[PDB]
Design a protein around this ligand. Sequence first.
Ligand code: HEM
Ligand SMILES: Nc1nc2c(ncn2[C@@H]2O[C@H](COP(=O)(O)OP(=O)(O)O)[C@@H](O)[C@H]2O)c(=O)[nH]1
Ligand code: SF4
Lengths: 509, 1233, 225
Amino acid sequence: MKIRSQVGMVLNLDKCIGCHTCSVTCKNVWTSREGVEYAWFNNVETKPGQGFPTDWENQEKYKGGWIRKINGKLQPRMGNRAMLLGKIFANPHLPGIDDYYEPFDFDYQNLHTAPEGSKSQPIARPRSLITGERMAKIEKGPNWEDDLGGEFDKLAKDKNFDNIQKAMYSQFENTFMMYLPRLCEHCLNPACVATCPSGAIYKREEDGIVLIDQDKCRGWRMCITGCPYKKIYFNWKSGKSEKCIFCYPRIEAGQPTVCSETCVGRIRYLGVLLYDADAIERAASTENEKDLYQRQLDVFLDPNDPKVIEQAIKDGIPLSVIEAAQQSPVYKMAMEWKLALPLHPEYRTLPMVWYVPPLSPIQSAADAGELGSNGILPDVESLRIPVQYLANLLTAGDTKPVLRALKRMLAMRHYKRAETVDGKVDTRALEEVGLTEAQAQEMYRYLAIANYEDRFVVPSSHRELAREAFPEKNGCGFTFGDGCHGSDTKFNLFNSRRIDAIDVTSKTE
Amino acid sequence: SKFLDRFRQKGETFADGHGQLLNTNRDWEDGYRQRWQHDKIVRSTSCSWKIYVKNGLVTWETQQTDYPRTRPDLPNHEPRGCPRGASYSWYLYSANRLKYPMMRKRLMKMWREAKALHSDPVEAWASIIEDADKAKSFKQARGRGGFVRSSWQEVNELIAASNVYTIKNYGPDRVAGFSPIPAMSMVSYASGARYLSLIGGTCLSFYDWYCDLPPASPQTWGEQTDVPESADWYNSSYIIAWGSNVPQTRTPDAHFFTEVRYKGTKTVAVTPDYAEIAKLCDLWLAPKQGTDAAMALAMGHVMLREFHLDNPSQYFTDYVRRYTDMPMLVMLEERDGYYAAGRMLRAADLVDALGQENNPEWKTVAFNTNGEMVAPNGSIGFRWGEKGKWNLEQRDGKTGEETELQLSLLGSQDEIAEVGFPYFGGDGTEHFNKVELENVLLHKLPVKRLQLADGSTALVTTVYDLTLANYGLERGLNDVNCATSYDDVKAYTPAWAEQITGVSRSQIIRIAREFADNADKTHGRSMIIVGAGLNHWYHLDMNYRGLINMLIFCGCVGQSGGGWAHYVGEKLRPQTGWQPLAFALDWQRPARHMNSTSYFYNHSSQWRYETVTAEELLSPMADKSRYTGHLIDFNVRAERMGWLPSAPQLGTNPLTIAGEAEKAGMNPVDYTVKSLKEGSIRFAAEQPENGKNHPRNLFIWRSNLLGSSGKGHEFMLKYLLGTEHGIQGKDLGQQGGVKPEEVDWQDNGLEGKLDLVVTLDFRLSSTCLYSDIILPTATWYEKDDMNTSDMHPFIHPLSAAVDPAWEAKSDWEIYKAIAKKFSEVCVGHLGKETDIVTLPIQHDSAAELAQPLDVKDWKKGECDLIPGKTAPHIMVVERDYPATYERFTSIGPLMEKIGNGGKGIAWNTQSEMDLLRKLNYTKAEGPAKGQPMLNTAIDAAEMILTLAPETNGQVAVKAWAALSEFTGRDHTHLALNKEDEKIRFRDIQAQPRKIISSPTWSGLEDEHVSYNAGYTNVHELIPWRTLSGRQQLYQDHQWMRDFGESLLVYRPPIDTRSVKEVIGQKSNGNQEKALNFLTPHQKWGIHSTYSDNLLMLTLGRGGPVVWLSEADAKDLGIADNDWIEVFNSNGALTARAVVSQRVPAGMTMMYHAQERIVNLPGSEITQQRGGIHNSVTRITPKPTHMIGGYAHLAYGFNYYGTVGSNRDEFVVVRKMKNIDWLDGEGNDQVQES
Amino acid sequence: MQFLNMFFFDIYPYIAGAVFLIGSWLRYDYGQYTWRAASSQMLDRKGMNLASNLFHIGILGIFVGHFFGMLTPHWMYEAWLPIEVKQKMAMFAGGASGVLCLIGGVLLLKRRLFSPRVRATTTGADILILSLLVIQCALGLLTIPFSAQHMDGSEMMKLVGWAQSVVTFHGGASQHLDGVAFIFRLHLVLGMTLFLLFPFSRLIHIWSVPVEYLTRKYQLVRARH
Ligand code: HEM
Ligand SMILES: Nc1nc2c(ncn2[C@@H]2O[C@H](COP(=O)(O)OP(=O)(O)O)[C@@H](O)[C@H]2O)c(=O)[nH]1
Ligand code: SF4
């Protein structure tokens, strides 16, 4: 029983407007450099579709995530240590640049320097950012399928359509689309870590953020295949891989991530989760994938249980981290209300970025309809987005927890209408899904009103603990290049000393 | 040593040896921390963004989340923002950034060679422009490269030289500037406008031009636009998003819509395609595009039936009684066996004139519940000429006593007359369904006979009865045209609309029923968000009136959480504090405002290709031979009748008119009228090609006019610029059609009219590309300015995060310098001149009560030319040309002398000025000595803030006081508890400030109620600036009744006949096909801005693209991303296809503004560079939008006038074959099959 | 000639060995961000599977042979592994590895130079380094027909003698080469030159062979540091 904390994220898909603001803000800050210009740590995808990279969800082709052997043990679908080591001179599964899109730019300067007397109006044509050559035609982008852009037969190739008769959805009246914004999951049992030969990828103990150490990474490029969400991007220029860093620089001080603070749809929730690190393998190795979701929930710990508080303390969790853990919106949605679900729990990584499924217009039916158990509002059975589709995406094929979520979302709508239109207290809907008046009220508070202070509850990473903040405060930033950062042994070949350090030791003890 | 570290650290394992805690170095993490850290943050932007500077450069931006929080029971605004907004930072040092003033080489060569022969710049300009081979040698260079680096010193001089030369020979109104949406940057827009206003140049409009202006609004409420704020959406329990792609186009506010769904609110999306908006609703109805009025009619029908007749609603009934013109009495005209509804009955028509001696002919009449006839309060007549009677208290305007108007005559009529109503549901093209009934539908209306004050007898009935009649409600009089059941196919039944729209009748019924039930239950909390989906069709008025009637029948307007929510391109709230700065009304009155659609229709000569004839738009009950001519003829008439503005106004330099009058021994005013009658002086409009009645100098800033908003791009390029174009059809001349009967014709139209086109921008846009001079302006991150919005009540700033880079300058500094140079270069050419300025009859002014009973053309001798009544005013404006720069940079005296005001009221603002003198300091000496200064943008902003009621609680109270006179009701309480409030530019810099409630608007800034349009009308009984003073369902103006729009009626999309003459004419070998060409606002830009931004381009498809349904795409052999060509009579465009299922067969969408500078290959139809979306559209004005001098239908800059509708358009689509870039690169392609 | 003889085989090897060692260390302590294999696979997967595997598996056979071949003393299985048996093993086993390497090497070089994406993003050292190894491998194979003339191992005995003198710091190591065919001299010089150019190229990935991975725990967590 080793309790550890992490700030997880819950995205409410019901409110996502598919604007991409999140993707841009991240790109401006973290990935505008040459080498990672095609990488989108946060990218939104329209579904049905094959996503970015193309068909990333197809683990039979890309070999991501884990598999559970017959002996019950866990093994990267890429292969065991030797199998993986043997694919090093050429990762046979590695996704190629074209799988993303060839990053392009346009020749704007032609608009300015076009010489006098041009036969035709000057123009700015596309150009490869990889070769610098003229591109005859832009044939792909990172958000190319945006808003059902592309023939249905192409889009329906979407892996989540497996086991569903998709013929009916190609019909106009049955059209449906939703948005899937995604970043790195910052898993509890991450596959990338297990698939990096040099040991350069690690999970931070204090906040559970997973990072690729830019000093130690050797560019063995195996991790890319190991990540089933394909959220690690090879930086073609530096030779090392980079990934979403969960904005740790801000998180460390108790701020939201850029893609969270800038979400226009006010759909992202940041809250602490306390997990037993000792149960990771046991939960992730459960025999039936339809049990991974539940088994993960069991790995989370009740921040209000004193038994957990004391173990947390005992285990080094800062008081404030424990405090915020008890006011965590992420906990309320994944644990109490059961509205948040994991993304592809079947990859056995124990993902930490969850989603609330979206509602949708009721399906097309013969007559204009009849009042359901929810009156003029929809019944979960009438929603047009096929529940099995959602289940393939969030619950390993199990429609039960998906319906529960949707049904409760709708229940709240029914209880609130009775209250604000009829002025009556009606809990028929609530009683049917097993919710209390209080819980629906709290659901409304967080989901509907979503005050900034309720959407984001991020504690400090306490960088003062186990280190020496004082000399850092005083000398951090002066990047004159003292050649001594990054190593514990003081001795160095250039005969120098750390600028943010004290080398004249006290003699008064 | 990192090498020595290896030889050293493994802590405990966990998860049964599945894991290992390592105690190892993590200093490498500083790397990403060092990227995040920045030099500081600055607030700028309708969303406050934090600008992050780092290494002394702007590196990125994020949303400010410190807006003042809203009531606890409402979600807050933070963070707002959008994807376009988040990418702005890119522009600053991008490869498309304009760094220096640029000039066309050919023009620079002739300019320097001229200056060497003419020491005086004006003469040097005169030498080039007056030479036909010189003029044309650089006009043809337009859009064909050649830009060279120039200097501020050079361009400023050339510009002023050209401006002086043009004002001096042709006149000030031959100089113009186009700038849009001022709310985006009040001062940036005001800069060019102030300079143009001072020198007498014309200031073109934009709201009507973009077709963002909903004519139905001025029609029904006599207000251009006022709507509830997005926060208010949260107080609605039933919402319909009709033709409004909210999440994509109203991104920062969408959350109020997705969040209110959790409060129990039901939502419905009405779109022909599965739009992003559908994704967030409870129901999706997909009518055939352009057939919405129908559906709205059937819903209104069901409502009237079930909520007004079968089971009457206490709330809806009282509401329509006290707030609409339904009880008002309409006169019936006589016909061949039936009657037609005529003008409304005016108190005048009655013998005693109902006691009303002041404007009796402008007062409406109804019947109280005692059968007595009365002229109730609020009618427009009581607005001017008298006091305390322009309110909405249900009182007898004669005895000042509480009465009660009755709605239906039925049950007390003298007889049952039969009235004819026009029906167009049977006309239309082949692409839309039609229901055949009768061009005229006869209904049995309960009437009554009255004895007119002139002996004659006449029949009357109410707007109310006339309405139920027009909707098809059987009321007992056994009418063969009314409905027996919703299933009965009649004049606007659910079954009827199911055939037109394709939406099951059961749906029309269910929703109509829920919508109304909710409004009854909550007392008006049903709202309808509507956008360009409906407002960009030729018959936008019908779509909006359809939506409006449903809302009025359910008493939703004026109720928090209910109403008509129109959102498009924003809202400059502190108006009256900005109008004087932007149009220099503090120095001279008035300025030259112009409605741009008529302007371009005329000068880009798009009228010479007209295919639409007014005839085919007349009511079947109208004197066809009493409405003849080209649509442009109606405009010329409207202009000389004082209805619409003119530009250029007169066919003779207006600066020389004063001098000629003095030699005539009469004043300029009377001398002009004499001449106008005698034919001495003519309206320039009558002869737009004579050679002196066309604009010569055009300024464009904060716009991409020639590459975006410019409808009829090829016509614009041919006649306004004089370059090659892709127009495909022949003109009226070449075809043989009939010439207008008010305009000179000429087989070979005048080309290249614009002598000098100056564009201000920070990016080399499509407009810049076809310019003569590009002025490098500053981005929104390098200048100070202000912003307001329709979506919320916050006023925030734009701040320079850093100084404009390279040689950029703020729009303010740019016009300041041009003004300074104009002031010296004009010495010896223009001094203190006198200018004759025509001015159309203004709305919200006593003159709006011009022609009360009919229409009289003074040029037809039907009446006397009376400026201000049957013609525009003829004003005298003195201009101190050498004093321009000084006037530009100082606050005029007129504010102190004449005061300040708007929307009909006026107050004293002397105290404000004294305050300004203190914050802006004053002139040491010179022509404007002692006056407050206007040197910097801050000064100007403080002028707007200190002068506006919305931002100054002291001017706010003075305002309500002024209005209080008119109503007789105290309104000052609306501002009293905020009177000490004063918004300072530096204050909004630290935190966005909510504004003060003002009479300029009808919603309120309050802590218990949201800002909801019409709330002051319904709750403070303030009248709607309309004929009856109430919400006008009945349009009784001649032109409206004769064009079939007295009451709303379904109108099929029009035929632009732009396809059959060109289809197949230039086959490339691939199948061709006609498709409805819709251009809704896009997702990777705002209009044209961002359409060159790499972030947006990478998130979209990489350049211009058009969406086609799967069937249409396969029928044409088009695969996703294939190069295709869309073209018709007007021109052609090249792009790539986006094949998708969510696009209904039959239509095509090329999302609005993807412009002409990125990824466009040569067209196979014009052998030129492919065109843009507007290369296939063309202006086609509608008469009903030209009406003036009639209460709510009187003019107003951006308030009324012809609109740029274009959804009705059809194009030919086909896959491309040869893809040649025309750049000599040798990198061309060929698509097979 | 005798001057060039003592420079290249008595002095130069110590310059390249000194630069190789201290240069690797200094770049590991001050160039961590530059310590990578620099994969180009993603930019162009064509023929990379075949080509890279051929090259690496061949090059590794060489290294193993070269290593045990010349750094293993004689008295160690002087009976079971006499110098002439070692020559037969290297001529055939090491020679087959040579062909694989050379083919993969060449295919990779064809690629680096003519596949637009790899060529546009390549560095000069990537070309110089890949070219020297291809040349060095071809040289190595051309030495086989010469050694085929001394099946008694006399040639190998000379070279091995030289190598062992060098790595144990015994002067006069070049004497062991008296008589040896010139071809061998070129291979030895061009080979040592790769140790010199080593720390300034991508070859540093070699130090990073991920052997610790075969016994590491799957999950890694770094504590507060
Ligand atoms: C400084 C480093 C090197 C030294 C001292 C060296 C030395 C030798 C010697 C002495 C032989 C002939 C074997 C005998 O009969 O004794 C040989 C052969 C060969 N070498 Fe090298 N070599 C070096 C580096 C390399 C490299 C980097 C490559 C790969 C490109 C290579 C590829 C070969 C091949 C293919 C053969 C022939 C087959 C064999 O004997 O295994 N050598 N080398
Ligand atoms: N009901 C209705 N919806 C339309 C029509 N034309 C387009 N739409 C849809 O409604 C949206 C409105 O268009 P757009 O110009 O983007 O509007 P905006 O959101 O007001 O800026 C489009 O994106 C379409 O999905 C129409 O004629 N009727
Ligand atoms: S910013 Fe928020 S609403 Fe917009 S796409 Fe990203 S997650 Fe969805």
